[PDB]
Amino acid sequence: DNCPTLIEPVQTICHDAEYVNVTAEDLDGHPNSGPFSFSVIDKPPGMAEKWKIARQESTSVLLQQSEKKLGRSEIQFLISDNQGFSCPEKQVLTLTVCECLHGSGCREAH
Amino acid sequence: KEGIHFKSSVISIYVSESMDRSSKGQIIGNFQAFDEDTGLPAHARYVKLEDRDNWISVDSVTSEIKLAKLPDFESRYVQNGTYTVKIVAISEDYPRKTITGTVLINVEDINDNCPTLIEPVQTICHDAEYVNVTAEDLDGHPNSGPFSFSVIDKPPGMAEKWKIARQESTSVLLQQSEKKLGRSEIQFLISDNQGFSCPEKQVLTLTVCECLHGSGCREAH
């Protein structure tokens, strides 16, 4: 009676990254579960498709760029749980970039 | 039969210092009192002692303890990375009894300070070629470490005129190739090991002159 969600839907990533990983969570689960289905959105042209999918696992997804640009972009999602319940909330991600140096860490100052 | 006692003589907590985003209103714990004979909770009224900078507050009705300032790791009252406050809790109806305790809060460092040019000004003789300027950062390591100094690419050709020629953890030695008895204006850019640099400018005023043997600049006035 609940639908999957994105758990950090505002995420920074390193400049030199070519893949991004994000988890989804669902308010309800096993027993009534299996692996989730992830898809993104490609319509309209020139505007929608900044990211696409490369790998998918039960509870998380691995994304890859379409034009490889740097900065602020939205990634519009379609996510269903196994048995397929639907809710009026729209599923989304927003991504932006930092210059990384301290491993994963943004080099920036306070 | 005996009066109020503490379940711990001292309590100890940890936190980060402040820069920019720190939360107000902060709670850290309680200081409950008990009958010594059975350990069932008693009531007391509470007072604060020797808070040297006003960081802490106390609520008698809960024995709770609460923060009233933002923490600073460079503070003149912070020692070994710790700050102390003393509490006393005191009973009601006769005989009245006082019992003492302490709060220890530990504070970690942020790179909230930036290296500045402590040596804005120097005067230099006609046989010299090298001049030394120091910076200072107000954090310790890691939050300072070996500094990086540079001097900017404007005006055209200034790298032929005055340049960095050796560098230390705190400091830099300039050289000269202009070979002239006047003024130069030497903007530095300057980081600490973590990459932080001041929003404000850092510039050396430097005067080169003709000098007497073993003395400053020449004088006809």
Side-chain angles (χ1 to χ4, degrees):
Chain A
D1 83 304
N2 310 273
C3 283
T5 58
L6 292 171
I7 64 188
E8 307 200 308
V10 192
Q11 181 186 339
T12 313
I13 60 156
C14 296
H15 64 290
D16 66 352
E18 64 177 307
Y19 316 106
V20 65
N21 194 88
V22 291
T23 297
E25 184 176 282
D26 178 5
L27 192 68
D28 68 3
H30 198 267
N32 316 296
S33 58
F36 305 163
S37 296
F38 309 96
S39 295
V40 307
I41 295 296
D42 57 291
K43 293 152 185 70
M47 283 194 311
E49 205 168 33
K50 304 310 180 189
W51 296 77
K52 62 179 189 177
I53 296 168
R55 308 173 202 228
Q56 170 187 254
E57 297 196 275
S58 69
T59 39
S60 296
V61 62
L62 190 71
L63 300 188
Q64 187 171 3
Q65 290 197 248
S66 56
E67 50 187 70
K68 315 194 174 180
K69 279 288 181 162
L70 297 181
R72 195 187 179 223
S73 307
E74 199 154 54
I75 301 65
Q76 299 180 353
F77 262 98
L78 287 163
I79 318 168
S80 295
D81 46 13
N82 172 242
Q83 288 192 4
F85 194 85
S86 290
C87 321
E89 285 147 325
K90 296 318 182 205
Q91 296 137 331
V92 282
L93 172 66
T94 306
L95 285 191
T96 192
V97 155
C98 66
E99 294 202 322
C100 281
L101 179 62
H102 301 149
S104 306
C106 306
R107 73 170 278 153
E108 63 176 78
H110 300 85
Chain B
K1 199 177 176 283
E2 283 170 283
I4 47 179
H5 199 33
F6 281 148
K7 183 163 186 171
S8 187
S9 68
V10 59
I11 64 151
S12 299
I13 300 102
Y14 140 78
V15 302
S16 308
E17 93 159 313
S18 56
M19 177 60 159
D20 52 357
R21 282 169 262 196
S22 286
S23 313
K24 47 183 191 289
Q26 309 285 293
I27 306 287
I28 52 157
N30 302 77
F31 232 107
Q32 280 198 268
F34 306 102
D35 296 358
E36 192 171 281
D37 300 31
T38 50
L40 306 180
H43 170 65
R45 37 170 283 271
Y46 291 73
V47 177
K48 188 183 75 162
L49 311 181
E50 299 200 86
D51 187 1
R52 279 186 292 208
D53 195 29
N54 205 74
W55 276 51
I56 289 185
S57 302
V58 54
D59 199 346
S60 304
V61 305
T62 50
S63 69
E64 197 159 75
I65 316 199
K66 179 193 178 163
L67 319 189
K69 198 167 170 157
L70 307 187
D72 175 18
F73 191 70
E74 296 60 66
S75 182
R76 85 191 286 186
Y77 309 97
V78 171
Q79 275 77 65
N80 289 123
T82 65
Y83 190 79
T84 294
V85 189
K86 300 177 200 168
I87 295 301
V88 301
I90 320 185
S91 92
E92 307 265 70
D93 316 359
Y94 205 59
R96 303 191 183 99
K97 194 190 169 207
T98 295
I99 58 169
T100 60
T102 310
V103 180
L104 185 292
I105 193 152
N106 161 245
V107 181
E108 287 187 43
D109 194 3
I110 304 301
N111 190 21
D112 47 352
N113 301 271
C114 57
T116 59
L117 192 58
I118 80 172
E119 308 188 80
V121 57
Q122 258 307 8
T123 308
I124 295 305
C125 289
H126 59 282
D127 53 351
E129 298 175 37
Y130 294 94
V131 60
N132 185 90
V133 302
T134 305
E136 195 181 63
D137 191 359
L138 301 187
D139 323 284
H141 304 315
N143 298 299
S144 59
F147 297 2
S148 302
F149 289 94
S150 58
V151 312
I152 81 180
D153 54 344
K154 280 176 169 166
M158 172 64 153
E160 317 313 89
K161 288 173 155 177
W162 282 97
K163 59 158 73 177
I164 288 186
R166 194 183 173 89
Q167 185 194 240
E168 273 182 298
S169 61
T170 46
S171 66
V172 61
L173 191 78
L174 268 55
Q175 187 177 327
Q176 80 87 9
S177 286
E178 183 190 64
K179 310 195 303 186
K180 171 174 175 313
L181 313 185
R183 307 172 170 174
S184 302
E185 190 178 281
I186 309 153
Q187 183 173 350
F188 296 72
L189 293 189
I190 328 183
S191 305
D192 49 38
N193 200 60
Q194 322 302 96
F196 191 47
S197 312
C198 290
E200 293 202 61
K201 71 186 179 77
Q202 309 303 296
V203 189
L204 168 70
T205 301
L206 193 309
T207 301
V208 176
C209 71
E210 202 178 66
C211 301
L212 300 176
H213 187 56
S215 195
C217 304
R218 298 186 70 184
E219 291 174 285
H221 54 267

PDB file of all heavy atoms in Angstrom, chain A residues 4 16-17 22 37 40 44 56 75 93 102 107:
ATOM      1  N   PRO A   4       7.774   2.715  -3.797  1.00  0.00           N
ATOM      2  CA  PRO A   4       9.151   3.128  -3.591  1.00  0.00           C
ATOM      3  C   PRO A   4       9.452   4.612  -3.697  1.00  0.00           C
ATOM      4  O   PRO A   4       8.829   5.402  -4.415  1.00  0.00           O
ATOM      5  CB  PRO A   4       9.882   2.375  -4.705  1.00  0.00           C
ATOM      6  CG  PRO A   4       9.126   1.060  -4.783  1.00  0.00           C
ATOM      7  CD  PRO A   4       7.677   1.463  -4.515  1.00  0.00           C
ATOM      8  N   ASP A  16      35.085  13.957 -11.667  1.00  0.00           N
ATOM      9  CA  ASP A  16      35.656  12.827 -12.365  1.00  0.00           C
ATOM     10  C   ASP A  16      34.824  11.547 -12.317  1.00  0.00           C
ATOM     11  O   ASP A  16      35.260  10.521 -12.815  1.00  0.00           O
ATOM     12  CB  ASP A  16      37.117  12.559 -12.020  1.00  0.00           C
ATOM     13  CG  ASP A  16      37.373  12.110 -10.588  1.00  0.00           C
ATOM     14  OD1 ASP A  16      36.471  12.114  -9.726  1.00  0.00           O
ATOM     15  OD2 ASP A  16      38.562  11.838 -10.327  1.00  0.00           O
ATOM     16  N   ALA A  17      33.651  11.543 -11.678  1.00  0.00           N
ATOM     17  CA  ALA A  17      32.706  10.449 -11.705  1.00  0.00           C
ATOM     18  C   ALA A  17      32.140  10.284 -13.115  1.00  0.00           C
ATOM     19  O   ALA A  17      32.021  11.278 -13.822  1.00  0.00           O
ATOM     20  CB  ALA A  17      31.638  10.648 -10.634  1.00  0.00           C
ATOM     21  N   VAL A  22      22.513   5.439  -6.645  1.00  0.00           N
ATOM     22  CA  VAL A  22      21.463   5.824  -5.727  1.00  0.00           C
ATOM     23  C   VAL A  22      20.614   4.630  -5.336  1.00  0.00           C
ATOM     24  O   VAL A  22      20.198   3.780  -6.127  1.00  0.00           O
ATOM     25  CB  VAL A  22      20.602   6.965  -6.265  1.00  0.00           C
ATOM     26  CG1 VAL A  22      21.412   8.256  -6.314  1.00  0.00           C
ATOM     27  CG2 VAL A  22      19.911   6.870  -7.624  1.00  0.00           C
ATOM     28  N   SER A  37      11.789  -2.375  -9.880  1.00  0.00           N
ATOM     29  CA  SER A  37      12.016  -2.037 -11.271  1.00  0.00           C
ATOM     30  C   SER A  37      12.303  -0.542 -11.306  1.00  0.00           C
ATOM     31  O   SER A  37      11.414   0.231 -10.952  1.00  0.00           O
ATOM     32  CB  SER A  37      10.797  -2.471 -12.069  1.00  0.00           C
ATOM     33  OG  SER A  37      10.604  -3.877 -12.050  1.00  0.00           O
ATOM     34  N   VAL A  40      14.170   5.577 -16.015  1.00  0.00           N
ATOM     35  CA  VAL A  40      14.100   7.021 -16.079  1.00  0.00           C
ATOM     36  C   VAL A  40      13.232   7.442 -17.259  1.00  0.00           C
ATOM     37  O   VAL A  40      12.599   6.572 -17.854  1.00  0.00           O
ATOM     38  CB  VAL A  40      15.446   7.733 -16.008  1.00  0.00           C
ATOM     39  CG1 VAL A  40      16.213   7.254 -14.771  1.00  0.00           C
ATOM     40  CG2 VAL A  40      16.234   7.459 -17.284  1.00  0.00           C
ATOM     41  N   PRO A  44      10.590  15.328 -22.810  1.00  0.00           N
ATOM     42  CA  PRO A  44      10.874  15.812 -24.141  1.00  0.00           C
ATOM     43  C   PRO A  44      12.321  15.843 -24.628  1.00  0.00           C
ATOM     44  O   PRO A  44      13.193  15.785 -23.760  1.00  0.00           O
ATOM     45  CB  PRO A  44      10.247  17.197 -24.274  1.00  0.00           C
ATOM     46  CG  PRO A  44      10.243  17.740 -22.849  1.00  0.00           C
ATOM     47  CD  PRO A  44      10.136  16.465 -22.026  1.00  0.00           C
ATOM     48  N   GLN A  56      21.377  -2.246 -12.655  1.00  0.00           N
ATOM     49  CA  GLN A  56      20.284  -2.227 -11.693  1.00  0.00           C
ATOM     50  C   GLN A  56      20.389  -3.456 -10.802  1.00  0.00           C
ATOM     51  O   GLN A  56      20.669  -4.543 -11.301  1.00  0.00           O
ATOM     52  CB  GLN A  56      18.976  -2.298 -12.478  1.00  0.00           C
ATOM     53  CG  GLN A  56      17.727  -2.537 -11.637  1.00  0.00           C
ATOM     54  CD  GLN A  56      16.474  -2.768 -12.475  1.00  0.00           C
ATOM     55  OE1 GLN A  56      15.597  -1.912 -12.595  1.00  0.00           O
ATOM     56  NE2 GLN A  56      16.441  -3.945 -13.109  1.00  0.00           N
ATOM     57  N   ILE A  75      16.799  14.425 -12.714  1.00  0.00           N
ATOM     58  CA  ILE A  75      16.649  13.084 -13.256  1.00  0.00           C
ATOM     59  C   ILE A  75      15.282  12.526 -12.871  1.00  0.00           C
ATOM     60  O   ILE A  75      15.074  12.129 -11.732  1.00  0.00           O
ATOM     61  CB  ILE A  75      17.692  12.099 -12.745  1.00  0.00           C
ATOM     62  CG1 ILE A  75      19.167  12.419 -13.003  1.00  0.00           C
ATOM     63  CG2 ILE A  75      17.605  10.701 -13.350  1.00  0.00           C
ATOM     64  CD1 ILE A  75      19.725  13.663 -12.311  1.00  0.00           C
ATOM     65  N   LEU A  93      15.216  12.697  -8.736  1.00  0.00           N
ATOM     66  CA  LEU A  93      16.562  12.957  -8.259  1.00  0.00           C
ATOM     67  C   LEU A  93      17.065  14.282  -8.810  1.00  0.00           C
ATOM     68  O   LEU A  93      16.751  14.582  -9.961  1.00  0.00           O
ATOM     69  CB  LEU A  93      17.474  11.803  -8.664  1.00  0.00           C
ATOM     70  CG  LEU A  93      18.971  11.968  -8.411  1.00  0.00           C
ATOM     71  CD1 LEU A  93      19.311  12.042  -6.926  1.00  0.00           C
ATOM     72  CD2 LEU A  93      19.665  10.836  -9.165  1.00  0.00           C
ATOM     73  N   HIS A 102      39.481  14.905  -1.474  1.00  0.00           N
ATOM     74  CA  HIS A 102      39.800  14.271  -0.209  1.00  0.00           C
ATOM     75  C   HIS A 102      39.195  12.881  -0.134  1.00  0.00           C
ATOM     76  O   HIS A 102      38.434  12.527   0.766  1.00  0.00           O
ATOM     77  CB  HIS A 102      39.159  15.207   0.815  1.00  0.00           C
ATOM     78  CG  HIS A 102      39.672  16.622   0.771  1.00  0.00           C
ATOM     79  ND1 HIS A 102      38.912  17.733   1.103  1.00  0.00           N
ATOM     80  CD2 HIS A 102      40.908  17.071   0.387  1.00  0.00           C
ATOM     81  CE1 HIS A 102      39.722  18.787   0.999  1.00  0.00           C
ATOM     82  NE2 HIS A 102      40.905  18.448   0.470  1.00  0.00           N
ATOM     83  N   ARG A 107      36.520  19.674  -2.202  1.00  0.00           N
ATOM     84  CA  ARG A 107      37.693  20.371  -1.724  1.00  0.00           C
ATOM     85  C   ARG A 107      37.435  21.702  -1.026  1.00  0.00           C
ATOM     86  O   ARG A 107      38.366  22.365  -0.573  1.00  0.00           O
ATOM     87  CB  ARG A 107      38.725  20.592  -2.827  1.00  0.00           C
ATOM     88  CG  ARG A 107      38.455  21.630  -3.917  1.00  0.00           C
ATOM     89  CD  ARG A 107      39.674  21.886  -4.788  1.00  0.00           C
ATOM     90  NE  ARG A 107      40.524  22.836  -4.076  1.00  0.00           N
ATOM     91  CZ  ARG A 107      41.854  22.953  -4.201  1.00  0.00           C
ATOM     92  NH1 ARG A 107      42.521  22.517  -5.278  1.00  0.00           N
ATOM     93  NH2 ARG A 107      42.530  23.450  -3.161  1.00  0.00           N
TER      94      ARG A 107
END
